[PDB]
Design an enzyme around this catalytic site. Structure first.
Site, PDB file in Angstrom:
ATOM      1  N   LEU A   7      79.413  67.694  84.137  1.00 32.88           N
ATOM      2  CA  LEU A   7      78.104  67.195  84.552  1.00 32.88           C
ATOM      3  C   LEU A   7      76.943  67.648  83.640  1.00 32.88           C
ATOM      4  O   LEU A   7      75.783  67.440  83.988  1.00 32.88           O
ATOM      5  CB  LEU A   7      77.827  67.612  86.000  1.00 32.88           C
ATOM      6  CG  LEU A   7      78.924  67.284  86.999  1.00 32.88           C
ATOM      7  CD1 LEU A   7      78.793  68.117  88.240  1.00 32.88           C
ATOM      8  CD2 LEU A   7      78.939  65.819  87.324  1.00 32.88           C
ATOM      9  N   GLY A   8      77.249  68.250  82.497  1.00 30.49           N
ATOM     10  CA  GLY A   8      76.230  68.715  81.569  1.00 30.49           C
ATOM     11  C   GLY A   8      76.522  70.099  81.030  1.00 30.49           C
ATOM     12  O   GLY A   8      77.164  70.907  81.700  1.00 30.49           O
ATOM     13  N   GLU A   9      76.048  70.390  79.821  1.00 27.35           N
ATOM     14  CA  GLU A   9      76.280  71.678  79.181  1.00 27.35           C
ATOM     15  C   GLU A   9      74.959  72.377  78.887  1.00 27.35           C
ATOM     16  O   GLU A   9      73.992  71.738  78.476  1.00 27.35           O
ATOM     17  CB  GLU A   9      77.064  71.468  77.881  1.00 27.35           C
ATOM     18  CG  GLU A   9      77.818  72.688  77.392  1.00 27.35           C
ATOM     19  CD  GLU A   9      78.595  72.397  76.125  1.00 27.35           C
ATOM     20  OE1 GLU A   9      78.056  71.673  75.258  1.00 27.35           O
ATOM     21  OE2 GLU A   9      79.744  72.882  76.004  1.00 27.35           O
ATOM     22  N   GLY A  10      74.930  73.681  79.094  1.00 25.62           N
ATOM     23  CA  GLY A  10      73.729  74.469  78.872  1.00 25.62           C
ATOM     24  C   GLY A  10      73.904  75.573  77.854  1.00 25.62           C
ATOM     25  O   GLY A  10      74.908  75.617  77.142  1.00 25.62           O
ATOM     26  N   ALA A  11      72.914  76.474  77.783  1.00 27.73           N
ATOM     27  CA  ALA A  11      72.900  77.600  76.855  1.00 27.73           C
ATOM     28  C   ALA A  11      74.036  78.588  77.116  1.00 27.73           C
ATOM     29  O   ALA A  11      74.685  79.038  76.172  1.00 27.73           O
ATOM     30  CB  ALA A  11      71.554  78.313  76.922  1.00 27.73           C
ATOM     31  N   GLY A  13      77.352  78.556  79.137  1.00 32.55           N
ATOM     32  CA  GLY A  13      78.372  77.906  79.944  1.00 32.55           C
ATOM     33  C   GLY A  13      78.297  76.395  79.988  1.00 32.55           C
ATOM     34  O   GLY A  13      77.788  75.760  79.061  1.00 32.55           O
ATOM     35  N   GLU A  14      78.820  75.814  81.076  1.00 39.35           N
ATOM     36  CA  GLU A  14      78.877  74.371  81.303  1.00 39.35           C
ATOM     37  C   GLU A  14      79.000  74.083  82.811  1.00 39.35           C
ATOM     38  O   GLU A  14      79.617  74.857  83.538  1.00 39.35           O
ATOM     39  CB  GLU A  14      80.090  73.784  80.561  1.00 39.35           C
ATOM     40  CG  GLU A  14      80.062  72.277  80.391  1.00 39.35           C
ATOM     41  CD  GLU A  14      81.383  71.680  79.945  1.00 39.35           C
ATOM     42  OE1 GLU A  14      82.360  71.753  80.726  1.00 39.35           O
ATOM     43  OE2 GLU A  14      81.440  71.132  78.820  1.00 39.35           O
ATOM     44  N   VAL A  15      78.426  72.972  83.279  1.00 38.29           N
ATOM     45  CA  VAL A  15      78.508  72.592  84.686  1.00 38.29           C
ATOM     46  C   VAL A  15      79.620  71.565  84.898  1.00 38.29           C
ATOM     47  O   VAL A  15      79.662  70.554  84.204  1.00 38.29           O
ATOM     48  CB  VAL A  15      77.142  72.096  85.205  1.00 38.29           C
ATOM     49  CG1 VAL A  15      77.265  71.490  86.601  1.00 38.29           C
ATOM     50  CG2 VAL A  15      76.124  73.229  85.194  1.00 38.29           C
ATOM     51  N   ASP A 115      61.335  75.245  82.991  1.00 44.33           N
ATOM     52  CA  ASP A 115      61.899  74.192  82.130  1.00 44.33           C
ATOM     53  C   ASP A 115      61.944  72.815  82.835  1.00 44.33           C
ATOM     54  O   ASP A 115      62.986  72.161  82.833  1.00 44.33           O
ATOM     55  CB  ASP A 115      63.285  74.577  81.568  1.00 44.33           C
ATOM     56  CG  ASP A 115      63.683  73.821  80.307  1.00 44.33           C
ATOM     57  OD1 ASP A 115      62.788  73.249  79.655  1.00 44.33           O
ATOM     58  OD2 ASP A 115      64.894  73.795  79.981  1.00 44.33           O
TER      59      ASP A 115
END
Ligand SMILES: Cc1c(Nc2ncc3cc(Cl)c(C4CCN([C@]5(C)COC[C@@H]5O)CC4)cc3n2)cnn1[C@@H]1CC1(F)F
Length: 256
Positions: A7-11, A13-15, A115
């Site tokens: 469902l999306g990747e961040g700084a 980890g990842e969701v 953010d």
């Protein structure tokens, strides 16, 4: 639990989408690899609002951390903005109303998201807007005493000008500014500048009141008058959420 879809990747980890093969509870899990997430897990537990993503649980597996969260089946607000067009004025207004409700709640409990942008505003099955991702959310008020901010963070097209020009700045005006950039993007499917700097031509044109240029020319006179109050360089003379709630376009009845 069983991972199904990213469902999306961040700084950090990842969701992912975790649907248990027993309970079938479709939830979103931020899988954080490896002090900062202790503060993230904390703030998340104080969150109880309909326009704020619900924090379910946090299991630990040595180094692999897990963050169970409310799943927004409808996706995100970014995926609903048509490039160069945006979306209808009644749809943009209903999302701005829910954005302000979620920001007012956050501010009332001494929390700034830091953010605010379309990728962090997720829509549920009934199209309700929810504010997600508290990896940059800090405490700006504790025991009815306001603390100023110094750390620079966020996304350059959405940050307030004071964040890059001042050593210390109030938290709430920064969140109001980014909401104005979100509303600009919903009404015109375009971002107005790369950053609000004195070196950016598009930002300088806005300060010189050149609303004949894009994306201002694609926006009606009613919401544009609100944007003229939200996108003020001086954060002290910048409209507050209580005064946004009394704006003509904010209270303008809309349909179709
Ligand atoms: C069902 C679905 C979702 N739902 C969803 N739900 C909960 C989420 C929670 C978080 Cl934290 C997140 C994170 C939110 C923040 N981001 C970023 C860090 C922000 O900008 C860069 C990342 O995208 C990561 C996921 C996403 C969630 N998504 C999303 N897409 N889709 C499918 C397309 C479709 F609608 F069919």
């Amino acid at each position: 639990w069983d991972l199904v879809q990213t469902l999306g990747e961040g700084a950090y980890g990842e969701v992912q989408l975790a649907v248990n093969r027993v309970t079938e509870e479709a939830v979103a899990v931020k899988i954080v690899d490896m002090e900062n997430i202790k503060k993230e897990i904390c703030i998340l537990k104080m969150l109880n609002h309909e326009n704020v993503i619900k924090f379910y649980g946090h299991r630990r597996e040595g180094n692999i951390q897990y963050l169970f969260m409310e799943l927004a089946s409808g996706g995100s607000l970014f995926d609903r903005i048509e490039p160069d067009i945006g979306m209808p004025e009644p749809d943009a207004q209903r999302f701005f109303h829910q954005l302000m409700a979620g920001v007012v709640y956050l501010h009332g409990i001494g929390i700034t998201h830091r953010d605010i942008k379309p990728h962090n505003l997720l829509l549920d099955e009934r199209d309700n807007l929810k504010i997600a991702d508290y990896s940059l959310a800090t405490v700006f008020r504790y025991n009815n005493r306001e603390r100023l901010l110094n750390k620079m963070c966020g996304t350059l097209p959405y940050v307030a000008p004071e964040l890059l020009k001042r050593r210390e700045f109030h938290a709430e005006p920064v969140d109001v500014w980014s909401c104005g950039i979100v509303l600009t993007a919903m009404l015109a499917g375009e971002l107005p500048w790369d950053q609000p700097s004195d070196s950016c031509q598009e930002y300088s044109d806005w300060k010189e009141k050149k609303t004949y240029l894009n994306p201002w020319k694609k926006i009606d006179s009613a919401p544009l008058a609100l944007l003229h109050k939200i996108l003020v360089e001086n954060p002290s003379a910048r409209i507050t959420i209580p005064d946004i709630k009394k704006d003509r376009w904010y209270n303008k009845p809309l349909k179709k």
